[PDB]
């Protein structure tokens, strides 16, 4: 019944870049294909005078060579016709870190407690996503209250990602 076509997903209504600024702690994530951020992920979003949103992300990555590295990532966001969907160009402080361009959608957020992000890096022919990632972020590293957990679960279901997230540890590795 429920549609899994990317184009039908609801996003944050009238998203406010300025209220979203600040520190966000990744609590859980749905990983995409390939090398990705493993844990201890913390993001810091900022918005300049002109309305340009950017962010820096910190996190542990396990290199294919088994080297554990703390990646210092940077991302710049381009606005689209939907204030909640952005085009994010990203790169690392270190030249060997992954560089790319990914859609960045804010599915939902109350700005003060939690946020649900999503990106579809490859569309199936039917319109569903073939390779996606999603992060559940929190303002507080202690997490959310049960009431908030219930809203986050619903958003997960809405993206057709229910049961596919794993909790992320924070142990100050970076
Ligand atoms: C920039 C950035 C994002 C994505 C960073 C990525 C996609 C990092 C990938 C790390 C690579 C895979 C490490 C390779 O060793 C997130 C969405 C957290 C939000 C704001 C900052």
Structure at a glance:
The chain has 174 residues and is mainly beta. It is 10% helix and 46% strand.
Features:
monomer, 174 residues, mainly beta, Lipocalin, eight-stranded antiparallel β-barrel, 9 strands, 10% helix, binds retinol
Q: Layout of helices and strands, plus pairs?
A:
Elements: H1 17-20, E1 22-30, E2 39-47, E3 53-62, E4 68-79, E5 85-92, E6 100-109, E7 114-123, E8 129-138, H2 146-158, E9 166-167
Antiparallel strand pairs: 1-2, 1-8, 1-9, 2-3, 3-4, 4-5, 5-6, 6-7, 7-8
Could you please describe the fold and organization of this structure?
The protein is mostly beta strands and 174 residues long. The protein has one domain (1-174): Lipocalin. It is 10% helix and 46% strand. The protein contains two helices and nine strands; from the N terminus they run αββββββββαβ. It has helices at 17-20, 146-158, and strands at 22-30, 39-47, 53-62, 68-79, 85-92, 100-109, 114-123, 129-138, 166-167. It has an eight-stranded antiparallel beta barrel with strand order 1-2-3-4-5-6-7-8. A hairpin with a 4-residue loop joins strand 6 (100-109) and strand 7 (114-123). It is globular. The protein binds retinol (RTL).
Q: State the distance separating the first and last CA atoms.
A: 43 Å
Individual helix count:
2
Number of strands: 9
* CATH class type: Mainly Beta
| Helix-strand string | HEEEEEEEEHE
Under the CATH scheme, the architecture is Beta Barrel
Give me the CATH superfamily: Calycin beta-barrel core domain
Largest sheet: 8 strands, antiparallel, barrel
Helical content class: under 10%
Taken from the alpha-carbon principal axes, the silhouette is globular
Binned strand content: over 45%
- CATH topology title: Lipocalin
Radius of gyration: 16 Å
Give the structural class. mainly beta
Hetero groups bound?
A: retinol
Task: Enumerate the strands of the largest sheet in spatial order, edge to edge or round the barrel.
Answer: 1-2-3-4-5-6-7-8
Counted up, domains total: 1
């Amino acid at each position: 019944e429920r549609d899994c076509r990317v184009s039908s997903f609801r996003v944050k209504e009238n998203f406010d870049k300025a209220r979203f600024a600040g520190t966000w702690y990744a609590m859980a994530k749905k990983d995409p294909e390939g090398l990705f951020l493993q844990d201890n992920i913390v993001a810091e979003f900022s918005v300049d005078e002109n309305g340009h949103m950017s962010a820096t992300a910190k996190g542990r990555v396990r290199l294919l060579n088994n080297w554990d590295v703390c990646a210092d990532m940077v991302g710049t966001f381009t606005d689209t016709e939907d204030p909640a969907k952005f085009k994010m160009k990203y790169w690392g402080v270190a030249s060997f870190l992954q560089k790319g361009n990914d859609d960045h959608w804010i599915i939902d957020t109350d700005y003060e407690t939690f946020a649900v992000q999503y990106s579809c890096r490859l569309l199936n022919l039917d319109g569903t996503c073939a390779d996606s990632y999603s992060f559940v972020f929190a303002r507080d590293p202690s997490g959310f209250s049960p009431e908030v957990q219930k809203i986050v679960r619903q958003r997960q279901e809405e993206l057709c990602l229910a049961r596919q997230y794993r909790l992320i540890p924070h142990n100050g590795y970076c």
